[PDB]
């Protein structure tokens, strides 16, 4: 009965486990963590310098420990369970991988999530996971990822998994068509998130890009389920993001969106997503 767009309030760059409850306490229903790779091996949650102004850039955790901790906060019945914590984005830093490393990196991430987050299908964490890849050309990561989960008898866990192919930013930015095709190549026919905001080498075209993605998401045969804007920390820009029609707001300060959502002119149109808002479902106005 609620006609309002569910919004994902994504805590940006939450790479230390100590930071998780703090960001959820600020009101995030989601968080984002940067997954570093040593070869094909996902190793740390760690962003590194430079990072957003006003942020310490070098908080980190071992990937497995981070995933295990996410499990704690997202397993019903767990002492640490937060029913408000419904999704996380893994910003997979595969950008330096040689081609041979890409598929195994997907397998490795799948294995990590399987073991540490989903506990091999044994009362795993319930949050949705967005695999964010920085290259549409890394679709074999997704193929490798899916293979592992299916081969291990946990294809059903793919219900919890979504994808965001975002980049590369050189030689040129990806078109939507190119992105859509990359999903097709990954065997991905839904659970598609699109991220925007991080590139602005052409503000006119970036304005255009976002609107194009919004139009695409809302088109009859659209492939994008959710659009999230990296990042937004001010009330004004938070409102602007909501107003242009994004589904998710990546932010250093989740408390900002919480406040905006409570405001007149916002509380009638937008609301904080809950677990029952399928992140893979395109919002129909
Ligand atoms: Mg990141």
Curated annotation (Swiss-Prot):
**Cellular compartment(s):** Secreted
- Name which cysteines form disulfide bonds: 51-57
Gene Ontology terms, MF aspect? lyase activity; metal ion binding; phosphoric diester hydrolase activity; toxin activity
Query: Is Metal-binding a UniProt keyword of this protein?
Result: yes
Cofactor field: Mg(2+)
Q: Which CDD domains match?
A: GDPD_like_SMaseD_PLD
Q: Which InterPro entries match?
A: PLC-like_Pdiesterase_TIM-brl
| Superkingdom in the source lineage | Eukaryota
Q: Where is the active site?
A: 12, 47 (nucleophile)
Query: Tissue range of expression?
Result: Expressed by the venom gland.
Descriptive protein name: Dermonecrotic toxin LlSicTox-alphaIII1i
Please give the organism.
Answer: Loxosceles laeta (South American recluse spider)
């Amino acid at each position: 009965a609620d006609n309002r767009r569910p919004i994902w309030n994504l805590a940006h760059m939450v790479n230390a486990v100590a930071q998780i409850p703090d960001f959820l306490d600020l009101g995030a229903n989601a968080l984002e963590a940067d997954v570093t790779f040593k070869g094909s091996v996902p190793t740390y949650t760690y962003h590194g310098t430079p990072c957003d102004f006003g942020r310490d850039c070098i908080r980190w955790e071992y990937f497995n420990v981070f995933l295990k901790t996410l499990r704690e906060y997202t397993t019903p019945g767990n002492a640490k369970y937060r029913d408000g914590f419904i999704l996380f984005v893994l910003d997979l830093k595969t950008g330096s991988l040689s081609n041979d490393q890409v598929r195994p990196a997907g397998e490795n991430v799948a294995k990590e999530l399987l073991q540490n987050y989903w506990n091999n299908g044994n009362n795993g964490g319930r949050a949705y996971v967005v695999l964010s890849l920085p290259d549409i050309g890394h679709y074999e990561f997704v193929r490798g990822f899916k293979e592992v989960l299916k081969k291990e008898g946990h294809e059903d866990l793919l219900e919890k998994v979504g994808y965001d192919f975002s980049g590369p930013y050189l030689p040129s930015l990806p078109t939507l068509d190119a992105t859509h095709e990359a999903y097709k190549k990954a065997g991905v026919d839904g659970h598609i998130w699109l991220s925007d905001g991080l590139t602005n080498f052409s503000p006119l075209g970036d304005m255009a890009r976002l609107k194009e993605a919004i139009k695409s998401r809302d088109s009859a045969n659209g492939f994008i389920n959710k659009i999230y804007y990296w990042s937004v920390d001010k009330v004004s820009t938070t409102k602007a993001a909501l107003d242009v029609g994004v589904d998710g707001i990546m932010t250093n300060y989740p408390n900002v969106l919480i406040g905006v959502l409570k405001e007149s002119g916002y509380n009638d149109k937008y609301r904080l997503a809950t677990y029952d808002d399928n992140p893979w479902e395109t919002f129909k106005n």
